Amino acid sequence: GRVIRNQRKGAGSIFTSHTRLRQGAAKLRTLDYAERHGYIRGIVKQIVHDSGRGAPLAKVVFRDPYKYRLREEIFIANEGVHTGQFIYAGKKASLNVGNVLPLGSVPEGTIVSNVEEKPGDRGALARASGNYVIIIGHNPDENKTRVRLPSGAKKVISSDARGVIGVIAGGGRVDKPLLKAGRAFHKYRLKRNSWPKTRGVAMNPVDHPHGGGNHQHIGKASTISRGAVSGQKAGLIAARRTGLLR
RNA sequence: AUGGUGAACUAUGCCUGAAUAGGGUGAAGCCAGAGGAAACUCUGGUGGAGGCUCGUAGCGGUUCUGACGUGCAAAUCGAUCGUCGAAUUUGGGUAUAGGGGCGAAAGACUAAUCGAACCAUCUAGUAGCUGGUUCCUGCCGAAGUUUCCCUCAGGAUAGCAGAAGCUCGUAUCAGUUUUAUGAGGUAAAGUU
RNA sequence: GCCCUGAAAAUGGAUGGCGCUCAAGCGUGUUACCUAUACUCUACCGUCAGGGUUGAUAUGAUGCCCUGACGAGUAGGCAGGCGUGGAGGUCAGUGACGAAGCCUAGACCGUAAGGUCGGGUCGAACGGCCUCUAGUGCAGAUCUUGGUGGUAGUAGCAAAUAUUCAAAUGAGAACUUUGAAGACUGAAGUGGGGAAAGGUUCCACGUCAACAGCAGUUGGACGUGGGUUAGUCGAUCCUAAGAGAUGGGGAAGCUCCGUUUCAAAGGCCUGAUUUUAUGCAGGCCACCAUCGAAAGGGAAUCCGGUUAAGAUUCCGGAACCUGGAUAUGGAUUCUUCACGGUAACGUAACUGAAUGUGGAGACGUCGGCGCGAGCCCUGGGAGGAGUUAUCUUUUCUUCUUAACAGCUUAUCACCCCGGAAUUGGUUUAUCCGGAGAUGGGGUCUUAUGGCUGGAAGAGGCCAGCACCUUUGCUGGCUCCGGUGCGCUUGUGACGGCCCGUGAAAAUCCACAGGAAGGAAUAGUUUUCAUGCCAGGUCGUACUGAUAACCGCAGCAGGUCUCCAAGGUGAACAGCCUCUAGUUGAUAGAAUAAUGUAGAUAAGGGAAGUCGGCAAAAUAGAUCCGUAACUUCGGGAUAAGGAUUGGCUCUAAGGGUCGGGUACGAUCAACUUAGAACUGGUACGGACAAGGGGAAUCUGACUGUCUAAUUAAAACAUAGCAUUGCGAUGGUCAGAAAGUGAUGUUGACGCAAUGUGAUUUCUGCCCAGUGCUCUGAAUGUCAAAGUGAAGAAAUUCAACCAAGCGCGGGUAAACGGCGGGAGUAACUAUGACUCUCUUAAGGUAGCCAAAUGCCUCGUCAUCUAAUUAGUGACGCGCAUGAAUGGAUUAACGAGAUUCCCACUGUCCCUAUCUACUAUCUAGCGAAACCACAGCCAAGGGAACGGGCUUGGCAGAAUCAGCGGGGAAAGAAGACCCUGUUGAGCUUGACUCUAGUUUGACAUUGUGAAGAGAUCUUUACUUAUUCAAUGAAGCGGAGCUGGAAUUCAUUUUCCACGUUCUAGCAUUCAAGGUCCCAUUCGGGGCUGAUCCGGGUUGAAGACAUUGUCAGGUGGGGAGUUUGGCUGGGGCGGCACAUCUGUUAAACGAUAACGCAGAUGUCCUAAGGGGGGCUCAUGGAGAACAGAAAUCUCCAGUAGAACAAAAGGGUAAAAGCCCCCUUGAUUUUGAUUUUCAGUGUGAAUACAAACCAUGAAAGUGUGGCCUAUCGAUCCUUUAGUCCCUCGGAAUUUGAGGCUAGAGGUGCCAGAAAAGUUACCACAGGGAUAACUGGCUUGUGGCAGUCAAGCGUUCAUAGCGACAUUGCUUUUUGAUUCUUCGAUGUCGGCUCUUCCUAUCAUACCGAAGCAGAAUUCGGUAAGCGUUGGAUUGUUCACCCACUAAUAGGGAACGUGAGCUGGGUUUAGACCGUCGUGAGACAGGUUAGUUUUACCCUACUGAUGAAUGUUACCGCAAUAGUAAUUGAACUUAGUACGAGAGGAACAGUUCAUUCGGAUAAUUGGUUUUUGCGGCUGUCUGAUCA
Predict the structure, then answer these.
(1) Cα(A64)–Cα(A44) distance, rounded to whole angstroms?
(2) Which is nearest to A165 in space by CA: A63, A72, A80, A44?
(3) Do residues A60 and A42 lie in contact, with contact meaning Cβ atoms separated by under 8 Å?
């Protein structure tokens, strides 16, 4: 047979990311003395649009502790920040939108975003627009914290893991019908070559497992085992249930 | 099967450039007037939006089932037609290479090659199948049948045939009758 | 007996032909005669057999002779010879006095292959014989290479409008050169330049062999030369998307990863030196190769002139940049590092290191608005040219101003003053103001414009003088203005759009900071001026295409880009012109057919056709007017109507401008509306330029795709929904990896799918298959470990993960949605109860729908007529719900139906225009070809050009033509075979990458808790992950203080920064103390101390390696029987048995017929004994049609395991009694047969046994069937053989005899599929024509049982029998698969008769009229349509009639392409799937004639020359049918009704002409009219 279309994204030739207009990797600040023993203040210089992403970025400019200069970094902008805002970062900072605190330093029921999985990864969870995690509880001994991931999963992380207060800007984005194949063309030119999607039904027995036949139909179950093997996997993969919800 | 060569055509993404008369329709936004309690609705303007529309260059390639069909042309020529501001058109740079690539999907495209490219070797690949097989004359001269075979377009085996002769030569034979003596159960007859 | 009738088939026509009649016919008899390769006799050749002959003194003993007989021959075999290239010998061979070779209707020998000689050409080598050896003999192979024919002086050299006269050159001119004309490209060019590419094509001179598909004096050719000049233009430099070293890391390795990565990765700024230069000095800065753009970024150049060919490069002049050196003037300095203005900021200058920050480089698109530049238009003036018959203050042309430099200028931005309601300012576009608007006054940038310098001395245009030359010289003028919705490009300020916000870097500058360095008897500054020196390397020519590039080429194709004049007009459309450029494409004469491209048609108006295909009609603008429907956006140019030229006028729309603190004037526009007049009613006058409407199927839309047969209803899309995934991850890659894509990512994300906008809904089903599980059990489970037995190998027994097993969920997962029953007031409908299927029974909806076989469904409507269309109906072969179901406005080069308008599609053709064809000069192929080219019939491979019999036939040809040459194109794509393949699918057979588990190793330290090992959990240092220019870890401290003190602190928290877009750097200021004060340096602290674990997470688990189970079409390799009246299904004729087919020994076939076999039996085997069966008759309680008992008769009518046939009576049967011969060793024989195997049997022998008194009998079944190799496993036997250095015990291997199985039965281990297909072949074999048969089909006789008022034959025929038919359907499989082009229609010719009409006849139960049946008869006719691809059919209307057929089911180098029948796509059923179809639907490349004949037309040599007038052999032959008036309301007739011969006037179909008239046509461009444009207008 042939090598199918999803097996063909691994070698990553024309499928790589379209990286040109991107302002940079949006991260939080390296974890250092000043931030874990106290706070350090920047100001947000301009909040700007990043290509390929859905949410704006902010550029806050800190002062390097050990050398005379400025250093400016790329934060995914929480909703409500504004240029000219002081952004405080560190253990002793205060609870306000945009300030990055450790999670142990905030009461339960606090709404933070761009939170870290492990301390010093410079952010992981809830970076898409409109997302947030809630802090639902603490474990002050063998220090952990109980947070609610934007999907609704409940994860338990370290209490030295930082996160920035508030909701990520760009909420409401998918409320608007996209309305034409052109606007979906301008969406994925800045992301990657995924589009448009030929139904595996509509291709030949070589192109796909769903291909062939004098009618268009799958012919065998569209749910595939998690223990399937490379290229067998197309369709709903290792689903526990299927079909419209009620 | 192995080891090599190709994105100058074409496929799709990226980088950086360039290219596109004139018309029709007249969306938000905005201005004056008219009505009325109101929310608002009605008239005249203003503006100039859209994968809107007619149509040139451009890109295509619907119909004639036209011309041509040892052509101008291994895909062209004429009339007609689709679209013509965006999922557009295109130059160069660039990335993806053969059981791979790329595909808005036709098994399409990948240098006139694509249901597995191109080039050399393994390779004088294998063929129970088609075609061919080169001078004379003399003596002899068949077979399409038995048995067995994944045997039925083929082989082994026996038969028919040629050649080499060998021991011998009055002689045992014979696609024949006669006498003698068995077996038969078809034709007629109606058990013989 | 003969003859006739019965007796009819298609090109013309065959006793073989002519022809034959007291035969040349038929039946028979006697004779004569003809002639085969056979017969007889003879000669000769060879073959075979039988014999004769060895004596010197010859030449053969493979020899000579004698005698006889015999002679076909493919595949095949053998014997004997001929020929070729080399080797050994010999002829002391031949030969320049001519070897070899070649040509030779010259000669000789040989049966032949071949040999010998003569003559001619020719020039250096070569033969005969006894032998050796081999790349040794050609007619084919769609054979290889090479050469050449016929075709043929033929096909053609026809797009892009087009040429002509003269002169010059020359040997030669349609083509070269100049002039003169005529045209064209028309500035989106046929111009003026470049990019890629070429490479010298550029230019000059010479030359014309070849090339330029004609010519050539010309050339992009040929020979010889010459030509490309740079500090500024490019490259070079920078980076983009990417490529790629180093360090490291994999890899047997070629090499791979990665690009700042686990790295000790480097050279600077000057202070310290005045032994000398650079030691030592503090500080720094961590970006850490390189490559990557002639279109992006970027230091700087312009004008004029110049060459045969180069120029932003050379010349002359005028500038500028960069790198470097220093000198002069100015400026500054005593207030050491300038002043002014309130401010915006100003200026000739006017210090500045490390370090840091900011700007530039630096960016999308569209829309209008403003301002510029060039172009366009245009008035006054100064010149030159063209027109002037007349008019024209006229028409055309020259009046130009570079880089650079200095000075002034403007939107936007900004400052000051003042402080706004009575809110004002304000843009085309409504934004602005107490966060300070309008107003008054200023700053600023300088794209841009303005004046001055460049710079008039240049350039241009005029005139005037000299003159082989060289040529100059000489004057003049080179000026002042207007306008815009104009066009092109630049720019600025605004606006729109995005789930799209639209590069990087080198490079340069500014600012912050304050390192340092320097005024006073004098010290700086190269960012002010001026001056000085150097500016390298490679590119530079020319085309950029209807001949310089690529397409084999001098190819109508392909190929990125700039500039862009006037008119018409909306216009960069079309048409026409100015500047520049060509005039190249073979030509000349004629005007046949058929063509190709372009026009027109009387009347009708799709009647043509699969179908309105194709053409026509419409068209621009202005005013009037617009429907259903709709998602309210549209539909809409809906549909439809009215005007439009010319001239002369009227009206409305703008500007600049002066008013002491209402009006006047002038300038300049293309816009609209109105009114009179005007004419052959013409006016978007040419050009350019929608046809429209009522519905249906289908996809929402824009968009995309099979380049070169499909543009679609297919793919895509938005929208909808589902699924995995929280990074120690989801999906994927890699051979590996210190490895990679999504990811510069984080659920509003990434990945995997299915549906397809909107509206409206998405029913029931979890049994199957699949996926999943917070679920549970004690089933199965490998490796390791474990326990036992053994001397050990080893055997076994338990235990075990994951996986399956179990149970749960799951349908917008794959998918399914039946059967059997009941039950509502005539029949009947059937809401419901009941239950059988390992699940549920098709819900809403929709339908003969693209899904409905039957089927041309039934009903209505459309139409004169409808297999079409639409509306309804629905037990729907086989509709139906994200397999998505219904409905839908707008859209569509999609499929279909109807209507209006229009038409040559048609009736029904005709005419016309250019280019061909045709003829001529030059040039000049190819396809194809066995040999060829006249027919009829026959036979024959079943359709001959040749053969046999006839007809016939006269040189040589020209243009047409499409009948034939089963014409050419291609070792049939269809079907089938081969032990040939490939693509794809699966639960096929055999494995595999990956993944999920267990064990051992990495792997150390030790605690808890359950189980007779496991679950927790600690340790850190291995191992793993993560971050950072490895900065603030761990421990103790001091200060407060939450704290609340039960002795005193028991303990944790703390411990410099939160109104604000300011600022944070130099060992740190301060504080203190040192050193030898000397300017400054070294300490401590400021800033607590100790350990140098860089900081977090994880941790003996992950990971890693090696084994092990499981999972694994994601992938690989392979297979997917045989015979067969094609193949498939079935069957077993595949191993067997009986009867028959079988024709009296045996043998004998078919998918012939009737059946059977894969078992059954310790007796049904073996021996022995006694007895008699089936059945009938006659008797006996219950007792019956039969129980049981008894006697007779009883040849087998019973039984004998089973199929059938044989066999059997004191038995072979029935019943008893005893027994295991159904045993052991092995050889011979028969049967099927090779006299092999297996199976079954026969007869003995050697033992040992059963039975019987005994003879005897028995080696399974009374007889004919009931069965199996090698290899492997196993058992018995002897207790034998071997384990090979010698022994013992296990183990293993042998010999002999059994079993376990191959049914495809002489014995592989094996699923589909192809409509994407492939190869080698097959007419050994299908579909398709033909051939034969005729079952049928369809047609014609014979007897007449019988219908008909009686009446068998007016008119029939049943029962049946006898025939014919090749337009039925079949059967066979003879020709064709190295191809006979397949349906139907259109077109056109011809033949048959089986007569539909017409002619003439016979008949009736015929009065007439009418009709009917037959007779001769094929002369002549036979139609227009609706529905359908339709043949067929059936309807409508006409007709005298609307008969049946043949000709390769006539006819595709004649058409068409509707149908079947590829590849694309949709549906229904079916299959797990790829895929399949008694199917429906849509889209789909139709090649060649010039050859030979034939046909149709056209010439023609020889008939002594030549002319005119004829004859007529043979051939062809044509007219047709109807109606009206009359006869006549007569005849016949009660009447109703109602004819005919003759005569006459017109008509239908056909045919031949012809053109007076009518019509069509029009290049008479004959005359007139009209448009745009050009010639200056009138005119032409």
Answers:
(1) 15
(2) A80
(3) yes
| Protein-proximal positions, strand C, CB < 7 A | 240-242, 285, 355-358, 498-503, 701-702, 714-719, 721-728, 730-734, 740-756, 766, 769-773, 808-815, 883-884, 983-987, 993-996, 1026-1029, 1031-1033, 1055-1058, 1060-1062, 1064-1065, 1096-1097, 1111-1116, 1466-1477
One-letter amino acid of A168: I
Determined by which method? cryo-EM
Question: Could you give the count of Cα atoms lying within 13 Å of A26 in the half-sphere of its Cβ?
Answer: 29
Tokens of A74: 């790329």
